[PDB]
Amino acid sequence: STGSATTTPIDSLDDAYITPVQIGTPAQTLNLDFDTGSSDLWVFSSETTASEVDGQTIYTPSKSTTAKLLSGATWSISYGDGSSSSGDVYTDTVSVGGLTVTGQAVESAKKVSSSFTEDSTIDGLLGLAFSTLNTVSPTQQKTFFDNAKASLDSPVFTADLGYHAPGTYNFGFIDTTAYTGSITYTAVSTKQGFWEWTSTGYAVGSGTFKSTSIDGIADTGTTLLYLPATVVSAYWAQVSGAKSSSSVGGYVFPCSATLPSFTFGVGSARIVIPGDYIDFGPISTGSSSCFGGIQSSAGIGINIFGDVALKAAFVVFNGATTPTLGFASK
């Protein structure tokens, strides 16, 4: 089997992408944020405390003939940005772009933090990191990809994110018309439960490529590109009005500037981020300062190849027993 779904940015800055997912019988469609940086599939529901629900579509398990409560299992998760949610667990049928999985755990939120209540566009998250990061207890639950593998034509999934435009998530096949050149594969370390890999170096604009190992994770659920402080400083040093602002939280530059490109190495190949993708957007509407797309990972602890980097390439999450990550220009 295979699946194909359109993913669309939730706003004009590409803050995050949502993809519709059908849960239960008959199907209830919810727009979830596909996150390669965690392993929990959780949604807003009829169990979510009322005052924390605000504009999202919820999943009601009592209206699904295929839902089953998973006795005694509970979950609790917190994210990099400080948000969190917790609740109980049901198993149900979930389908994405035509690919159906029976018995998938769908974690039902009893409570959600403020930032989730505040964003009307995201109905929950669908985790696609390794199952060892799953928060359910006492027994962890498999992600939608892991439950899907047995039926997939091939055990992979690809992410083709667009810049200010929809894109696609594919399950079980590699669409050869969506990229140019050939895909270059790099090893993944699953020690930390992420799709963790090491870039062989970087280049800023038309300058030299420096070979230096940069270990990071490929995370479709992080908006920005977070790299080591000395590489982020070498990039901004090439933009005349950029400065690090403590008040805004990062490097800012005049919206007026033409930013240089950023290239990252994958093995012997190079993936080039055009400069316009690096210009995240004005600090406030009408402002003349814009927030930069590449920022320091020093305070986070790990480098993160987020959406700014992933939307410049076609990326293959090869889920074979020894997983690998593939990148191609597009």
Partner: peptide
């Protein structure tokens, strides 16, 4: 307004 999906 950025997001950064697991981790303490």
């Amino acid at each position: 307004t950025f997001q950064a999906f697991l981790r303490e």
